[PDB]
Amino acid sequence: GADLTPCAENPAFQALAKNARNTTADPQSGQKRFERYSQALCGPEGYPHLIVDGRLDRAGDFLIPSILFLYIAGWIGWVGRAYLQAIKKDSDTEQKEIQLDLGIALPIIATGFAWPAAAVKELLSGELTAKDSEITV
Amino acid sequence: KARVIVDKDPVPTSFEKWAQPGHFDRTLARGPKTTTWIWNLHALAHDFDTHTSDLEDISRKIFAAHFGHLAVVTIWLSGMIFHGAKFSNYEAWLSDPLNVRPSAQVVWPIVGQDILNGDVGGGFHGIQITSGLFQVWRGWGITNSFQLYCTAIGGLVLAGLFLFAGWFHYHKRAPKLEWFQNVESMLNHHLQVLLGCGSLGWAGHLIHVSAPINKLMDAGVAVKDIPLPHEFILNKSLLIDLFPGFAAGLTPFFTLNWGQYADFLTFKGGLNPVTGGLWMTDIAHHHLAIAVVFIIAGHQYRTNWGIGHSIKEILENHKGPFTGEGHKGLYENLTTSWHAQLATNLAFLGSLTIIIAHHMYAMPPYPYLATDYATQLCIFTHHIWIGGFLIVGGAAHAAIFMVRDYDPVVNQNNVLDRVIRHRDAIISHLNWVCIFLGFHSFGLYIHNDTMRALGRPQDMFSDTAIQLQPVFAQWVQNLHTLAPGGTAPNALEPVSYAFGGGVLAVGGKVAMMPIALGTADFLIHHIHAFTIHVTVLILLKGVLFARSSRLIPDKANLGFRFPCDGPGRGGTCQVSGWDHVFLGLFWMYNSLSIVIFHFSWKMQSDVWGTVDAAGNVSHITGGNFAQSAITINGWLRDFLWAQASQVINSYGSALSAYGLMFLGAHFVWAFSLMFLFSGRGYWQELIESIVWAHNKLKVAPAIQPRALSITQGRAVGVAHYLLGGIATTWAFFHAHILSV
Amino acid sequence: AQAVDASKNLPSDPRNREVVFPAGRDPQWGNLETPVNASPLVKWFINNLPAYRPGLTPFRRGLEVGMAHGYFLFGPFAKLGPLRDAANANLAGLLGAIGLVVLFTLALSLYANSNPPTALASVTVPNPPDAFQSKEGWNNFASAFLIGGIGGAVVAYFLTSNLALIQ
Amino acid sequence: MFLISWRGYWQELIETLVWAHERTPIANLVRWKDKPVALSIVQARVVGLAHFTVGYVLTYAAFLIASTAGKFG
Amino acid sequence: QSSYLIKFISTAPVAATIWLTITAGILIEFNRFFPDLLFHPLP
Amino acid sequence: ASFLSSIFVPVIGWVVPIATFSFLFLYIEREDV
Amino acid sequence: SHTVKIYDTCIGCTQCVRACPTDVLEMVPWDGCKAAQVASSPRTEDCVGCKRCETACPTDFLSIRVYLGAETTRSMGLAY
Amino acid sequence: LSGKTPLFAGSTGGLLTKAVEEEKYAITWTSPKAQVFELPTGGAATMHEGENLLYIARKEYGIALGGQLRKFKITNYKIYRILPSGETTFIHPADGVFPEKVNAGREKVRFNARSIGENPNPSQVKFSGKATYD
Ligand code: CLA
Ligand code: CLA
Ligand code: CLA
Ligand code: CLA
Ligand SMILES: CC1=C(/C=C/C(C)=C/C=C/C(C)=C/C=C/C=C(C)/C=C/C=C(C)/C=C/C2=C(C)CCCC2(C)C)C(C)(C)CCC1
Ligand SMILES: CC1=C(C/C=C(\C)CCC[C@H](C)CCC[C@H](C)CCCC(C)C)C(=O)c2ccccc2C1=O
Ligand SMILES: CC1=C(C/C=C(\C)CCC[C@H](C)CCC[C@H](C)CCCC(C)C)C(=O)c2ccccc2C1=O
Ligand code: SF4
Ligand code: SF4
């Protein structure tokens, strides 16, 4: 809402497309940019306003980038957790945090392509009352 | 006694110590039980005094470390000359220096940096530099890119050559201690060869290469027609036509008929009207005179032939009535502590760097420098800040010498011991001066600010109202204008037109003109002295009270760098010699940030501007400095609010990054206030609760996390506080003049 | 070699004579005897000032002190104060100067009523100064400061205002 | 000042002024009854924040009123 | 030996620097060809 | 009626501080309270 | 002025008494048959609250504590 | 108190008006050799061959000096407290043994038989004049 219209009907978007300001080395990068942003909704400024409501029509605004992060983010955290727990079994744990043991890390880094499958499998994520409880309350 | 003694194969060159971190220290070599080990690894990497109790190993590390540093500076310089060759408009600037801006960078055509590649003239789209290397290389006579290309390669070869030296010396051929302690041999060699012969050889350049090339180029001949430097040596007819003094040859030199060389060794004492800059012949006569002085000055000391002084002898003789033994024992401290040497060298080299900037603006020593107002402020502002940093370092190491290397046996009733024994009188009186000035320097601004708001403009301290004229400076100014006639009569023009004379006009721009001094200029000079005095109060107190105090008598055993003693005694917070330096940096800033504005606003208002052929000068801000620089609101209105319009409006232009850099610094600045205002006690408790969450999900780290140390928190803040401050006015200075 | 190098150790050298000494004979004490602090000229001047002069009553001291300050404080208010360019410029200085004397006398009697600890002894004045160690002495000093201060300002007003007639 | 610079630097500075006043000849007559010491650690925090807050208040007030009043919206 | 050199790269800064350079190069090189992607286009 | 401000302003700025500070100083410096 | 309290978890390191600048602490014999010694705080007027002893005691939490209280010339470390 | 003062020209840092009015201190020690030692407050001084004496403002300066004397292997450092009336008390060692080495004559004081965690809550002792640590 808020006086939000499609692009082509909006005169502001039609004017900004002329002033290209080509980003990349390609001469037609500016024209290709504005043509691609024709799909989005444009306000009085002509700048596209993205709707992150959750509409399947506007899924590319937030929904598709959103899933792309969490798959990557869980890859990073799940790899760091498994590498950290693996170090704990070895003798000198503090040194491996600094000087990484690639024999342990790189196999673990290879995994994580399916972290949710492993995550749901571990219903015991190490949580107990045996942790740092730290004066009485 | 000054013989060369060298140990052979001191240490191997194995790569295993790289894998072993913290090898240099014993405690760190054990292991990283906590995160503070990581921060301590960096804070002790260069502190060789802590690694070993052996002075010889410390000296060898230092001598080799300097060589690796010169590699960095040479690589930085070799890249500078390289960018001038490939990514630059130098060849176009040479033909049309006034109407073409200097650029040396090309941002790539990616996400949208390309707007930064603005039209700087000469068919080149790039960032407009302000270092002034275009003016430097022109004075060097570099008229083509290949001459510029070859010089870059030599620096890299020179860089690796320095790098090979530190390897050769630390691993293979280590000098012993007695080689380093020969200070008398060091001073002679550096004075005569490094400073003396280096100046003499550079005069060979000015006489053979630069001045003929410059004398041709400013005369109207194109760079295409200018011969190369080698042709002057082979063919003397071209040189004799420009400088007829060479027809006599070298015979007038040895026969003391030095008047024959007056054509190309002048004492004009002024700027060249064509190119805003000092005469090249005056710079040739310059270095030749100074080289003889340096060559002569270096034979003072003895060095194995019985002819020369012992510095120990001279110092011991300079005792007096008030100073019991005078300078007895200083030679031992200077020869037994690297920190004392670093303190003297930093303190005066920093004061030297400040003295350069004051000279370079009034008498531009390069061609086409004053017309480039962008370069002058950036060149002035840069060195002014560098010297301030180094002076503070001189006080820090002065305290480190005390806590570490001060021996009471050596310093017995000498000039130093006698200073420590009355430290209270030195500081108490300096405390009085800082309070005296701060009232009568800043209070006058408040009185003017109060009166102008009250509607009483006749009660202010101003030029029309009550006026405080700097008669002593006006007095000294008048002498230098009248000097070329009577005192030092051989000079034709006054030394600098800043003192007085006439307006010099290069193109439409004014290069330099007399800087009149009034009540407003009176009102700022003392503000520097006031801020400088407080900076000395903080730093000087750090040196004297580092060993002991009435509050703490055992401050030496704790060390130079400790946060406190404890809560009691009312509180022992920031009592160390380190913490004094931490506070002095804020005052080193406030001392310095006003200096660059006093230069920036005045020159825009009184000196820099455009001049008409009739003789009427239209300055940039139109004399607003006279009446507005006597109130704090005028600085806020006419200097900060007004001149910053180009920065905020820089978006969508080539200067748009300055608007970003002007702003990102403000974030980094306030980010400093986290670490200065806060304390570790809060942060470790917060980290404790966060550690529980990781224990819950079994993501607990092996190296147990710890908050930053107390001294580090103060350190990280002042690092941000300064970086956010300097980076802010850095972009404001750039974008203002780059538009204006 | 020059003889100046050989004589550096001898006590006959003019260098080796030391001007600075410990406060009294005890070096543990704070002060240091200096030509500014312990010279006969400075000692005579300070010890014979009204605050330290021997054989004077507390009232006589404040009168000498007040007459000086009253005569001094007239200047800043007249020439540099407001209404400095007007017929009544000198008159404003007389009132403002007497104003400080009242405030100054208030602080004196106010400091007096609060039990003053002591009057300290230093190198420049070895003996204790006077009977300024009691409320009675300080109170008489305050009343004397008021009389002299009002008189001194009037004197500076009379001379300054009637200077042209004196010329 | 009170937030950044902490006590131990200041109390040392105070000891010097105490030395001077006790050793200045004419000012030896007048002396404090209560010994002057630096502000405590918690006191300086209080004094510092009150300054940080008062300036935060008066500054925006003058901008809030004058910007709106001079233009009258 | 070679083992001593490999552990130097295994340390945190060199391991972080090499990995983080590759991460930055991938994003920089993607924005080169595919200039600007505010949203995924909609089939 | 405007003459009241000419009498009330100075006593607030001068008389009241002098009376308060003078009493408070002697009160805090008193040995027995 | 201050109050230095010594708790049961001492083991006789003798580190507290050494770190004290003003000699507020002292090691005394304990009536424990197998306990070698224990610290003490006999002259508490001279405590200057610098908390060096709290840094020296190696127990998991400190057997010795220094609770701040009424100040004086000695506790505030005023030579003047 | 009997001893020779160490030889030093003097210093601004030292005894002040507190010494006359309030409890000046004095340290005594005997030296085997005349040596240069740093003073507690600024400068250096030469101790005499035997029975040195130095007047001191605060007790902290004396014990801080004693730690320096132990570097020169002088362990017979004695401190006194001098009131304005001249009362001198053997203050630092009450008995000849040092504080570090145990002696039967001493007695424990301010000993809390409870552990530190077993201290009562302050709400239990409010409006009573009692303190938690007591
Ligand atoms: C030729 C290769 C080589 C090799 C194998 C060694 C090997 C060794 N050197 Mg050595 N050295 C060399 C060249 C070499 N050096 C050269 C060329 C110099 C002259 C500068 C020195 C000077 C030197 C000194 C003075 C010392 C050593 C020491 C050592 C030992 C420990 C070093 C260590 O673990 O830290 C490894 C550390 C690093 C790899 C980091 C170094 C970073 C470089 C030098 C600077 C980079 C600056 C950079 C531009 C800053 C950018 C900042 C910003 C972008 C973030 C080890 C046996 C030390 C020793 O023996 O200890 C007792 C010692 O004190 N060396
Ligand atoms: C010739 C110059 C010089 C030299 C050789 C030294 C040498 C030394 N200093 Mg020193 N110092 C200097 C100048 C110098 N200083 C100046 C100018 C100052 C005033 C600012 C100081 C202030 C100072 C203090 C306060 C201390 C030292 C200490 C030391 C010693 C250990 C430092 C250490 O471990 O290094 C490693 C140092 C670091 C890792 C600090 C990194 C700081 C970074 C570079 C700040 C960021 C600046 C950067 C430009 C920002 C932009 C880039 C960034 C955003 C990426 C060592 C002997 C220490 C000591 O106790 O000596 C025994 C100490 O506590 N110095
Ligand atoms: C704007 C902020 C500010 C101000 C005004 C001050 C002021 C001062 N600092 Mg300072 N300081 C600050 C920020 C500031 N600091 C910060 C942020 C830091 C941390 C880095 C420090 C760290 C610091 C140190 C480490 C030191 C100082 C010192 C000083 C003093 C220098 C003496 C002087 O200028 O004469 C006093 C001048 C003024 C106070 C200026 C304004 C006075 C006007 C003209 C008069 C007021 C009018 C009237 C009388 C008001 C009466 C009102 C009535 C109703 C009651 C002074 C009290 C030094 C010091 O105390 O030694 C002398 C010192 O060593 N400061
Ligand atoms: C600290 C800096 C400073 C200075 C130098 C002045 C100076 C002045 N102010 Mg001002 N003012 C200041 C700060 C300052 N102001 C601030 C911060 C404010 C804001 C609160 C104001 C607000 C203000 C107002 C509102 C007014 C003034 C006015 C005046 C003028 C009259 C002064 C007067 O009557 O006092 C009289 C002064 C004295 C009685 C004593 C001065 C001290 C003497 C000279 C000391 C000498 C010591 C001596 C050398 C040592 C001897 C050594 C011994 C051994 C012999 C004068 C020009 C008035 C005016 O209209 O201006 C024209 C006025 O109405 N002021
Ligand atoms: C050189 C010198 C100097 C200087 C000096 C001076 C400058 C002085 C001061 C001056 C002064 C400061 C003076 C004043 C005087 C005053 C007077 C002259 C007074 C008068 C008074 C009167 C006469 C009064 C009376 C009266 C009375 C009391 C009451 C009633 C009224 C009548 C009025 C009657 C000095 C010392 C610093 C230092 C050394 C050297
Ligand atoms: C914030 C703050 C802290 C806490 C600050 C901390 C803990 C800074 C931590 C900085 C880094 C981000 C910690 C983690 C570094 C990791 C190695 C980074 C991950 C590696 C990837 C980035 C590659 C203090 O300890 C402190 C102490 C005294 C006065 C003020 C303060 C203060 O203000
Ligand atoms: C300046 C400063 C001092 C010295 C400041 C002192 C001694 C205060 C001096 C101020 C005098 C008393 C004048 C102040 C007058 C006020 C304008 C009014 C206060 C009165 C109210 C009670 C009404 C500290 O003691 C200190 C301690 C810990 C951290 C930082 C600092 C610190 O920054
Ligand atoms: S636990 Fe503490 S108090 Fe007990 S002996 Fe050890 S250091 Fe002393
Ligand atoms: S605070 Fe600690 S170290 Fe200081 S006197 Fe008291 S017990 Fe001893």
Give the Cα separation of B443 and B631 in Å (integer).
10
SS3 B128: strand
CA distances from B732 to A62, A84, B116, B593, D10 (A): 38, 47, 17, 13, 36
Measuring from atom 15 of ligand 5, which residue has the nearest CA?
Answer: C68
Instruction: Tell which residue, B500, B450, B465, has the closest CA to residue B607.
Output: B500
3-state secondary structure chain C: CCHHHHCCCCCCCCCCCCCCEECCCCCCECCEECCCCCCHHHHHHHHCCCCCCCCCCHHHHHHHHHHHHHHHHHHHHHHCCCCCCCCCHHHHHHHHHHHHHHHHHHHHHHHHHCCCCCCCCCCCCCCCCCCCCCHHHHHHHHHHHHHHHHHHHHHHHHHHHCHHHHC
Chain B nearest-CA distance from E17, in A, is 17
Region class of C23: left (phi > 0), else alpha (psi between -120 and 50), else beta: beta
Q: Chain C residue closest to F30 (CA)?
A: C114
Side-chain half-sphere of A51: how many Cα atoms within 13 Å? 17
- D13 neighbors B431 (Cβ within 8 angstroms): yes
C-alpha torsion sign, points B424, B427, B430, B436: negative
- B540 neighbors B396 (Cβ within 8 angstroms): no
Q: Are G23 and H63 in contact (CB < 8 Å)?
A: yes
Give me the residues paired with residue B174 across strands: B7
Chain H nearest-CA distance from C25, in A, is 10
Region class of H10: left (phi > 0), else alpha (psi between -120 and 50), else beta: left
C-alpha torsion sign, points B558, B562, B565, B570: positive
Residue type at position A113 = F
Give the Cα separation of B678 and B721 in Å (integer).
14
SS3 G33: coil
β-pairing, B609-611 vs B617-619, is: antiparallel
Residue type at position C11 = P
B544: which residues sit within 8 A by CB, 6+ positions away?
B419, B420, B423, B426, B427
SS3 B102: coil
- C141 neighbors C50 (Cβ within 8 angstroms): no
The 10 Å CB-count burial string (b at 16+, else e) for B91-117 is bbbbeebeebbbbbebbebeebebbbb
Does B679 sit in the ligand 6 pocket, CB within 6 Å? yes
B256: which residues sit within 8 A by CB, 6+ positions away?
none
Give the Cα separation of A111 and A80 in Å (integer).
11
Put simply, the chain B residues between 680 and 739 with a CB less than 8 A from any chain D CB are 717
Give the Cα separation of B106 and B113 in Å (integer).
10
Q: Chain B residue closest to C84 (CA)?
A: B459
Q: Is B573 annotated as a binding residue?
A: yes
Side-chain half-sphere of B1: how many Cα atoms within 13 Å? 10
Tokens 């020059």 belong to C2
Name the residue of G4, G59, G60 to mutate for ligand 8: max ligand atoms within 8 A of Cβ: G59
Give the Cα separation of H18 and H16 in Å (integer).
5
Q: What is the Cα Rg of chain B in Å?
A: 29
Give me the residues paired with residue G67 across strands: G3
Burial group, residue C143, by CB count within 10 angstroms (0-12, 13-18, 19+) = middle
Q: Chain A residue closest to B29 (CA)?
A: A95
Ranges assigned E (strand) in B73-152: 103-105, 127-128
Instruction: Tell which residue, B257, B543, B220, has the closest CA to residue B404.
Output: B543
Give me the residues paired with residue H4 across strands: H52
Instruction: Tell which residue, B545, B574, B550, B551, has the closest CA to residue B562.
Output: B574
- C123 neighbors C20 (Cβ within 8 angstroms): no
Q: Is D9 annotated as a binding residue?
A: yes
> Which chain C residues are Cβ-neighbours of F29 within 8 angstroms?
114-115
- Strand order of the sheet with strand G64-67? G64-67, G3-7, H111-112
- D13 neighbors B541 (Cβ within 8 angstroms): yes
Q: Is B360 annotated as a binding residue?
A: no
- H106 neighbors G26 (Cβ within 8 angstroms): yes
Tokens 């002085």 belong to B293
Does G64 sit in the ligand 8 pocket, CB within 6 Å? yes
Put simply, the chain C residues between 6 and 35 with a CB less than 8 A from any chain B CB are 8, 14-20, 32
Resolution in A: 3.2
Burial group, residue A2, by CB count within 10 angstroms (0-12, 13-18, 19+) = exposed
Question: Which one of H65, H95, H102, H103 makes the best mutation probe of the G interface by having the most chain G beta carbons within 10 Å?
Answer: H102
Give the Cα separation of D18 and H16 in Å (integer).
9
Q: Say if C88 is an interface residue toward chain D (CB within 8 Å).
A: no
Query: How is residue B176 written in tokens?
Result: 């012993």
- C111 neighbors D30 (Cβ within 8 angstroms): yes
CA of C142 to the centre of ligand 5 (A): 18
SS3 B377: helix
SS3 B579: helix
Measuring from atom 3 of ligand 9, which residue has the nearest CA?
Answer: G20
Instruction: Tell which residue, B382, B381, B390, has the closest CA to residue B595.
Output: B381
Full DSSP string of D1-63: -TTTS-HHHHHHHHHHHHHHHHHSTGGGSS--SSPP----HHHHHHHHHHHHHHHHHHHHHHH
Measuring from atom 38 of ligand 2, which residue has the nearest CA?
Answer: B43
Residue type at position B400 = I
C-alpha torsion sign, points C29, C34, C36, C41: positive
Does B705 sit in the ligand 3 pocket, CB within 6 Å? no
SS3 B137: helix
B445: which residues sit within 8 A by CB, 6+ positions away?
B523, B630, B631, B632
- H60 neighbors G78 (Cβ within 8 angstroms): no
- B134 neighbors B102 (Cβ within 8 angstroms): yes
Minimal Cβ distance to H64: which of G5, G7, G21: G21
- The experimental technique behind this entry is cryo-EM
C84: which residues sit within 8 A by CB, 6+ positions away?
C78
Q: Is B429 annotated as a binding residue?
A: no
Q: Are F31 and C115 in contact (CB < 8 Å)?
A: yes
Give the Cα separation of D19 and B423 in Å (integer).
11
CA distances from B564 to B575, G46, G70 (A): 6, 19, 22
Secondary structure of chain C: what % helix, strand, coil (to 5)?
A: 55, 5, 45
SS3 B609: strand
Ranges assigned E (strand) in B106-165: 127-128
- B75 neighbors B189 (Cβ within 8 angstroms): no
Q: Is G20 annotated as a binding residue?
A: yes
Measuring from atom 4 of ligand 8, which residue has the nearest CA?
Answer: G10
Which ligand is closest in space to the CA of residue G4?
9
- D33 neighbors C117 (Cβ within 8 angstroms): yes
Residue B637: count other Cβ atoms within 10 Å of its Cβ. Answer: 13
- G1 neighbors G70 (Cβ within 8 angstroms): yes
Query: How is residue C153 written in tokens?
Result: 């300002």
Give the Cα separation of B211 and B217 in Å (integer).
10
Region class of H83: left (phi > 0), else alpha (psi between -120 and 50), else beta: beta
Question: Which one of D11, D13, D15, D19 makes the best mutation probe of the H interface by having the most chain H beta carbons within 10 Å?
Answer: D19
For B510, the enclosing helix (H) or strand (E) is strand B509-512
- B599 neighbors B380 (Cβ within 8 angstroms): yes
- H124 neighbors G55 (Cβ within 8 angstroms): no
Residue type at position B444 = L
Query: Do C and E touch (≥3 CB pairs < 8 Å)?
Result: no
- B14 neighbors E4 (Cβ within 8 angstroms): yes
